[PDB]
Structures are given as structure tokens and as C-alpha cells.
Design a binder for this molecule. Sequence first.
Ligand SMILES: [Mg+2]
Ligand SMILES: [Mg+2]
Ligand SMILES: [Mg+2]
Ligand SMILES: [Mg+2]
Ligand SMILES: [Mg+2]
Ligand SMILES: [Mg+2]
Ligand SMILES: [Mg+2]
Ligand SMILES: [Mg+2]
Ligand SMILES: [Mg+2]
Ligand SMILES: [Mg+2]
Ligand SMILES: [Mg+2]
Ligand SMILES: [Mg+2]
Ligand SMILES: [Mg+2]
Ligand SMILES: [Mg+2]
Ligand SMILES: [Mg+2]
Ligand SMILES: [Mg+2]
Ligand SMILES: [Mg+2]
Ligand SMILES: [Mg+2]
Ligand SMILES: [Mg+2]
Ligand SMILES: [Mg+2]
Ligand SMILES: [Mg+2]
Ligand SMILES: [Mg+2]
Ligand SMILES: [Mg+2]
Ligand SMILES: [Mg+2]
Ligand SMILES: [Mg+2]
Ligand SMILES: [Mg+2]
Ligand SMILES: [Mg+2]
Ligand SMILES: [Mg+2]
Ligand SMILES: [Mg+2]
Ligand SMILES: [Mg+2]
Ligand SMILES: [Mg+2]
Ligand SMILES: [Mg+2]
Ligand SMILES: [Mg+2]
Ligand SMILES: [Mg+2]
Ligand SMILES: [Mg+2]
Ligand SMILES: [Mg+2]
Ligand SMILES: [Mg+2]
Ligand SMILES: [Mg+2]
Ligand SMILES: [Mg+2]
Lengths: 202, 120, 51
Amino acid sequence: SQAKREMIERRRNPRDLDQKHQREERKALIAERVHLYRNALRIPPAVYQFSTFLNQQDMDQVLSLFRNYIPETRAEKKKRLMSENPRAGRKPILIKFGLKHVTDLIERKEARIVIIASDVDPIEVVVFLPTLCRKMGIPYAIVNGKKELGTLVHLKSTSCICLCDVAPKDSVEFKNILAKINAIFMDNYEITMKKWGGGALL
Amino acid sequence: MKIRTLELREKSVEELETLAFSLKEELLRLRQQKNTQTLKPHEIRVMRKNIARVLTVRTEKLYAEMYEKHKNDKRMPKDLRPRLTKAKRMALTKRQLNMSVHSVCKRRRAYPRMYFSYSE
Amino acid sequence: GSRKTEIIKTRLSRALVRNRPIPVWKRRMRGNTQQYNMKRRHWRRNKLKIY
RNA sequence: UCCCCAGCGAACCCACUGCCAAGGGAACGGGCUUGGCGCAGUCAGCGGGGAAAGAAGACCCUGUUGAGCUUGACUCUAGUGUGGGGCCGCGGCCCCGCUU
RNA sequence: CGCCGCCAGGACUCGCCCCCCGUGAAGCCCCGCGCACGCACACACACGCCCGUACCAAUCCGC
RNA sequence: UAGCACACUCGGGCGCGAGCCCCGAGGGCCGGGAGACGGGUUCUUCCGCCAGGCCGCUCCGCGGAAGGUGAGCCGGGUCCUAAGGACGCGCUGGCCCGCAACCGACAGGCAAGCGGGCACACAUUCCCGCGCCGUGUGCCAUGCGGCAACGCACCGUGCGCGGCC
RNA sequence: GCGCGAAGCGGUGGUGGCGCCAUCGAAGGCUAAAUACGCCGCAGGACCGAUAGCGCACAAGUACCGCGAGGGGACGGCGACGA
RNA sequence: CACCCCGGUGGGGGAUCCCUCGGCCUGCGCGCCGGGCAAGGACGCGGACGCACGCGAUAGACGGCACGAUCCUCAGACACGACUGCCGGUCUCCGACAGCGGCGCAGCCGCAGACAACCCCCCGGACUUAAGCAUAUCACUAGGGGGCGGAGAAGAAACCAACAGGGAUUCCUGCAGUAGCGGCGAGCGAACAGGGACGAGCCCGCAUGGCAAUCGGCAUCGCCGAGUUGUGACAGCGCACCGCG
Ligand SMILES: [Mg+2]
Ligand SMILES: [Mg+2]
Ligand SMILES: [Mg+2]
Ligand SMILES: [Mg+2]
Ligand SMILES: [Mg+2]
Ligand SMILES: [Mg+2]
Ligand SMILES: [Mg+2]
Ligand SMILES: [Mg+2]
Ligand SMILES: [Mg+2]
Ligand SMILES: [Mg+2]
Ligand SMILES: [Mg+2]
Ligand SMILES: [Mg+2]
Ligand SMILES: [Mg+2]
Ligand SMILES: [Mg+2]
Ligand SMILES: [Mg+2]
Ligand SMILES: [Mg+2]
Ligand SMILES: [Mg+2]
Ligand SMILES: [Mg+2]
Ligand SMILES: [Mg+2]
Ligand SMILES: [Mg+2]
Ligand SMILES: [Mg+2]
Ligand SMILES: [Mg+2]
Ligand SMILES: [Mg+2]
Ligand SMILES: [Mg+2]
Ligand SMILES: [Mg+2]
Ligand SMILES: [Mg+2]
Ligand SMILES: [Mg+2]
Ligand SMILES: [Mg+2]
Ligand SMILES: [Mg+2]
Ligand SMILES: [Mg+2]
Ligand SMILES: [Mg+2]
Ligand SMILES: [Mg+2]
Ligand SMILES: [Mg+2]
Ligand SMILES: [Mg+2]
Ligand SMILES: [Mg+2]
Ligand SMILES: [Mg+2]
Ligand SMILES: [Mg+2]
Ligand SMILES: [Mg+2]
Ligand SMILES: [Mg+2]
């Protein structure tokens, strides 16, 4: 019926798009109906703390420290191992990455700085990572982009990033960047852990 | 068996394609003479069978030729793979069935099979 | 009935070419126990189920 | 039509069947008892009888056999309706807004 | 009518009229106009697939 | 035994054989001829019969051997939809249901073939005559008459609005 | 199935609750062999011997019937196969 | 004369007996379907060919190998291999798609359909027994739906026990027609042991950080991809196998 076809057009209900060719149209509609519902609910502080992520200028200052410690690529590793001394030099300083590895370095209190992605879904993959980094005192920052963290370690995306020590050529840059993000994230923990977002903001 | 297989192995595959077309023509002339006149009883029989004989040698030469073309191919054509059974084609290989985890490898390596005899 | 599909006429032709006596040279073969075709079909007595 | 003929050619039914009278008998016999009769075994009519043939009485009763149907039968049940709970939203005074 | 007459009947059909608390299909093709596009009717040449096609007031269905 | 032809009659023929087969005559009687569905070779020719046909048969819808069905124009499909179906997906524990591609008419809508010949039989199909329809290629012109009702330039494609009972 | 919803210790102890003592470690996964079995092949048998034995020793799931789902028979024998 | 009975001969019919390339039962073996187009079907295929059986336009023996002289109704074929056997080719069309799904995916694959004895999952009767009947029984059957495999399923204890403790599963014996369930009616009904067959144990996850050490694909030793929302490991197989007696 023509009135009903106009009726299913006025409401934008993804369950109306039941045919196979409407599948890419449907999941675009699901993505926006979730987004309107996600932000109309009272977002708890555990989820909403990732909405407060790091400034574009501050993110570029943070990642510029990390780009000195980017791990080797697989092409670089391959010619490193056929060299005469693969373990030449001292122990290098690398970005440590991956959720299993990074939270192990956090609980062992040897991570100096932890970057957590903001866009990670399921968000519960990283919801403990701020509160764990405070319980160890490790300074942390939330940065928008799992994708931007992935390019530091030559992946498509990675959820959390840390490094365990800083070269002495970057030490005064490191203390400036620790003071910059602790005023945002670490020292405002007890404020961010009560702050509800979403429909609570209205 | 008027056309013998001994002569058909010498011809090439496209040369057997023209022979089967030429022999099909003569079969049509034989089926003409059967309808209009008499024939020796197995003339149509014989010409039908050496069409089949030329085409078989064509197929047997073509299976041999196409095998050596796609022998060292990543995916051979389905004609040239052995037709076991759909279940047997989808079976895991003996290498795949022998695959075991690292703990089963170390245990079989560190505690190998012993060869012994007991007597009381 | 003078209007038929292609399937009906092929089945009707197959029923027609079948309906013939034993060829008379088969009566001289050894071990031929058949004397007449018992599967002969007459059009008025036996019906074909070709619809 | 029948009847008679040429040719063709069934079925029903069938324990076995000479016919009566009375008697006895499971209380109405073709067969038993005692009497009365008839028997060449054919043709055609015929409907008295064979308690004629149809059909394991449909009536009636019995069955701890049914089914259809009914309801104030017994036990349940779809449906309708009700209460409570679960169904993860915000606000304000059970009530009122709100939308997500 | 031009390049056998006369009369009657008739399936059907246009339009009037009547009937209905019954108002008597759809879609493609096509056609017309409107507005656009760009062009091929004629003409000439070429071509036209598959299936069915006999027969049945004793040929069917009721053995 | 019940039952089975009892509007035909006369002559002739073929034939071993005749009430029934054929021919002629006479006397009567009633449908006959085209399609569908259904049948499926029963059609037609030749030969037969000691079998079948509620009798007989030399006949036959029987037995045997053959022959026969020719389409741009007839019907259907390559077209369209009707009432309606629907194997997919949604909804499901399963249906129902929702959307519905696709489908659904041998009497709907609906391009175009008639006259005759031939022939054992078959042909609007073959043949003859005269036509017609569609498709595909080529080859382009760039408009007029009548106050008017309208007449004509044998021209195309797309959209929109309409157009049947 | 629904409601409730755990723990660092938990489950269980023929099964009310609680306590003891005892014994195991669920809510993740794989695993031969011994076990079962029709068609079919093979070999047997105190079986049946053409109304028996399979429905079928035979042109048997055939002929045939039913709109259909389906139903479903009957029928063996010359001899030295030389006459 | 008919009728009846007995016998003889002839009919009639197919009992009996004898036969049996068949069945039935038991054991063993095998346990192998499918887009490489299955099961099943349709239609065709023989010189004379209907049925049956065989076969697929290579259509009634096509090839290889083995065999070695007949096949036969006619005609014919045949040591340039008859008749055969084993294996392989060819293998029409209908029938498994509105398809569905996996993998970065120039593309490559899978699922569907068959099978229905065995086995696994779900759904699930009633006749029947109770001398009626409703719970019960039949029966967690029949039946229907789904799904495998040569077996399946199960399976290495959140087990049994109460001992001086045993030790995956499955099967047998046995506990045992027992404890128990049950209008405690009809009826139903296990388990640990003890004995035995057979025996077998293992794995994922929380794996490095002095660098994913891992995998998929390709036109391949190089790309691309997966992957840090976390990837990662080799002990078993194979061939040969007579010809005379
Ligand atoms: Mg018809
Ligand atoms: Mg009839
Ligand atoms: Mg008489
Ligand atoms: Mg008396
Ligand atoms: Mg007396
Ligand atoms: Mg009389
Ligand atoms: Mg009387
Ligand atoms: Mg009675
Ligand atoms: Mg009583
Ligand atoms: Mg009479
Ligand atoms: Mg009359
Ligand atoms: Mg007619
Ligand atoms: Mg005739
Ligand atoms: Mg006769
Ligand atoms: Mg289909
Ligand atoms: Mg029409
Ligand atoms: Mg013409
Ligand atoms: Mg005619
Ligand atoms: Mg305990
Ligand atoms: Mg106890
Ligand atoms: Mg476990
Ligand atoms: Mg006998
Ligand atoms: Mg029998
Ligand atoms: Mg009937
Ligand atoms: Mg006698
Ligand atoms: Mg008999
Ligand atoms: Mg057996
Ligand atoms: Mg095939
Ligand atoms: Mg051969
Ligand atoms: Mg299946
Ligand atoms: Mg019973
Ligand atoms: Mg009872
Ligand atoms: Mg009883
Ligand atoms: Mg009762
Ligand atoms: Mg299998
Ligand atoms: Mg298993
Ligand atoms: Mg029970
Ligand atoms: Mg791992
Ligand atoms: Mg000897």
C-alpha cells in the first residue's frame, strides 16, 4: 500500500529493510540509530571517560615522542637477522603494544607512559586500563584513534600503547608531556569517575 | 576394427578431430545405402565403432597432453585430479592429521618409544 | 487430441514404436522362450496414462 | 415379447432330496412312526410349499464394544479476561511531562 | 450505382432507450497529443526460430 | 436354460464358404459435418482371417506389412497481465504472515492468408495464383493546402498526460 | 523455561534443612579399541522345496488397478540341444 | 430309454512324487554418494530389435591389459584377436539457486540433494494393559523433523565410595526382576561392586618483548593480507603377493 510505503519511509526503521540488497543500506541505518540512542542514554563514567580524549596538538606532541621508539618492520627485522651481529648495540627502546603485553607491564609497574585508544569497541577491552594505570600511578592518556596507534607499531589498529623507558635525549620532553597529560587524565581521575555523559549532560 | 588403434596413435589430436568428422561423413553415406540398398550387416556397426575408436584415442592423447601441460600447476584442472570421492577429496591429508601441538611434540620427543622385552 | 505438448507427443511416439510384435527372426534364436509379445498394448483395451 | 428353430450361450443357488395325512418330536417334517399314494423320470404354464434365495436382524436385549451429539456428568483444555513479576530510558510533583 | 430485378428471413452490429443498493477486468503492445531529443517510413536487399498438426456421432468416460 | 440381430426385400459379384461383404434396384429410417477435453495410430493403402466382433463374415475401429501429420500468416511458446501461485528474504521453535523476483489464459488482450489445384490419406502448412506481416541492413528530406470542419508530405526515439469493455 | 544470581574456594556424598567428615574440580575441546548394523559380497545351514520359501525360481515391483497417496498378482520340468 | 454305482479306455484338471541357476536364516567381509552433476527420472542407442537386460550422440564391448577360437536366428564377423574377464574412457536432458555462506577476494571454495539398517539431536501418539477408566501402562515406543559416519555416540571424574578404599568411556557377565517407583493397583525398575572383553591418553586459554618468533593468498622468495580486540609447532607410512596340481 502506498500510505504504508510512505509510513516505512517516515520512520527509519532498519527492520523494514528486510531484503538482501538492502543490507548495506540497513547497517548504515543501524549505525546512526545506535549513535542517537547511545548518546541519549546516561553514559556512565567508565564509558564516557574515553570521550575525553587528547587534543590534536597534544596528540601530535605525544606521538612525536613515541616515533623515536617505533619497532622494526618485518623487512627491517629480516635483514637485521642476516647481519653479522643481530644483537649489536645495547638493548633498544621500543613501543610496547598489545593488550596482553601492555597490562602485564602496567601491573609490573615498568610502563612509564600508557596510551589508550578512544574508539575501541567493545569498550570493555580497555575500561580497566585508566583505573589500573592510576592504581599503579602510571601516567596515561586517551588518544582518539586505534588506527593512529596501529601505524606506530605497523598494524592496522592496536588498542593500547606503552613504552617502558625513555632515551636521555627525550627526557625533558618526556617530563613536559607527562605534566601535560596528567593535568588532563591522571589528576582528574576522581572527577572523571563521577562524570556521566550522554543524556545526563542535558 | 577396420581402423586399428596402431595407426591412430601416430596421428595428432587435431588430426584425429578431422578423422572423426571424415568418418562421420562416411557413416552418413553408409546410412544412406542401408535405407536405399542392402549392406553387409555390420558395416554401420564397424563405422560407428571406429568413430568411437578415433575419439577415444583423441581423448587418451588429450588426457596425456593436458596432464603434462598442467602438471606443475598450483591448481590442476579437475579432469586431471584423481576422482576419489567427494568425501575423500575433502579429507584432511595425512600430514594434517599428524599435526599436533607443541606439548605433544616435546613429550613424544623427550619420551620416545622404547623397545624392550620382559622375562620372569 | 491433435493439440499436444512436446512431452506428450514424445511419450506417445515412444509408446507407439514399442507396440509391435516380436521380430520373427527372434523365434529361431536358442533359448528364446518368448512366443508372442505379452506387453502388446491395444488402444481400446489398455490405456496409457499420457496426459 | 413369450413359443418353436440355427448359431452363440451365462448367473443365482446347491447337506442330501418321490409325494401326502395324522402323530410324536426343539411344542408347524421331504426324511422319523403309523397309515394314504405315486413312480419312462418329458413340454409349457404356475406361484401353495420348500418355515425359498437375498444379508453374521437395522427392532429388542446383552457387551464393563463404540461412535455422532447434548448438558446441571467427571477430569481437563484452546479462547477471553485478571493479578504479580521480567521487559536495563530521562525528568519533575501514584500523578504529570519527555524520547531515546 | 460506374470502372439482372422484386420480396422476405437472418447470426451479428452502431446509436437512442431501458435495467441495476449489480455500473459491467488488468497489463503489455499500440495510438494520439504535450514537451523534448535526433534523425530512416518509403524504397531496395536480406531473412522469418521451437512445439503441435493424421484420425475419432462403435475410436472419450462409465471394466 | 436365462439370454443374444429380429425395416428390410430382390438380383448380381468376388469367394471353399454369404441374411449381414461389395455392386445394382426397390422400400424405408435419421441427423450429418467441423473444433476442444479425452483417446493415441484407431487414420489410409495392401494382404489376411478358420482367432476377436453377444450369430456368420470374403467384412472390420481385428491380425500382419506399410504409408501418412511439412506453417512468418492456424494454435501455443520466444509477449502481456487476470483471479491466483510463489522454492528467496524477513518474522519464527515451527507455521501463518510481510515483501515478493518469478509465474499464472491452447476460449482473455492479442502482427499478418485467402482462392484453387494435387492427393490412397494428409495440406489455409505442399503446389499454383494473388497477397500480407515482422525483423535486420543500407540510402535522408528538415514541409504545405483549406475561413473552418480538415486535407496531406507512405519518417524516427524518449518522457509526460491520456486512450478499451 | 522463567525469576534470582554466586564464590575464592566450590561441587557432591540415593539426594529435607543444617553441621561434620570424606571425596572430587563443573559451567571449554579432542580421543582408537572392545559395541551396533541393512543393502551388497562371501561362506554356511537338523530351514522351505513352486498354493512352500522373499511379493518375484518365469519379460516382478512386471502385467494390471487407482485422480492420487498408493495397491499388486499369476505363471517352473521332452530328449543323448543328435533325430 | 433315462438315472445311479463299479470297472476299462479316452477326456478333463494339475494333486502327488522326483527335481531346483530360487528363497530364508546365520556367520563373516565390505561399508565406497553428490556442481568432477548424485539418487531417481525422461528420452534415445542393435543391420534385421518388441520386451527384458545393457548402454549414452564414443549410445547393444571405445581403449589398455589379460585371455586365445569361436559367436550365431539370418546375414556375417574373426589370429590385423572370436567369445570373454578386469579396469579405464565416453557418459544426452530432467532432477540439488529468488540461493546461502567463508577467505582481501584479479580470485578460490563450501553448503544444498541422496542414503533412513545401524547411530546422534528434537518432536511425539493412540490402539493396548489396568478385566470399566482419567494417573499409570503401551512408551520416553511407533511415527514425523533434523544430522553424521564406517561405525556413531560416549569418554579421561566437580565419579564411585564409607573400605585396608577403588579410578575414562563402551561392551559382556553380574548385582537383579533387586533397592525402589506405582489409583503402592496393573505394572514398571536401575546403580556401585566382583569377574571379563578391550585398553590410551590428551589439548585450548594468561606464550616472546633484545622487536608475531605465527598464518592465508598470489602472477612467489617478493608483495598483499590475517593478526597485538593476540597468531604460533610432524610421526607415521608404503610395496609385492603364483600357476601347476
Ligand atoms: Mg490432449
Ligand atoms: Mg474406453
Ligand atoms: Mg435356440
Ligand atoms: Mg404332513
Ligand atoms: Mg413313511
Ligand atoms: Mg416345469
Ligand atoms: Mg412358493
Ligand atoms: Mg446377529
Ligand atoms: Mg459385566
Ligand atoms: Mg433361449
Ligand atoms: Mg432395427
Ligand atoms: Mg470429427
Ligand atoms: Mg480403417
Ligand atoms: Mg474369423
Ligand atoms: Mg528450481
Ligand atoms: Mg490466445
Ligand atoms: Mg505461402
Ligand atoms: Mg479430413
Ligand atoms: Mg569440600
Ligand atoms: Mg548415602
Ligand atoms: Mg573438561
Ligand atoms: Mg507341485
Ligand atoms: Mg510363490
Ligand atoms: Mg473407483
Ligand atoms: Mg466310471
Ligand atoms: Mg500351479
Ligand atoms: Mg545376510
Ligand atoms: Mg551424469
Ligand atoms: Mg573393445
Ligand atoms: Mg541433506
Ligand atoms: Mg499391540
Ligand atoms: Mg482397559
Ligand atoms: Mg478387556
Ligand atoms: Mg473401554
Ligand atoms: Mg558416507
Ligand atoms: Mg566420536
Ligand atoms: Mg517405563
Ligand atoms: Mg595462543
Ligand atoms: Mg588334476
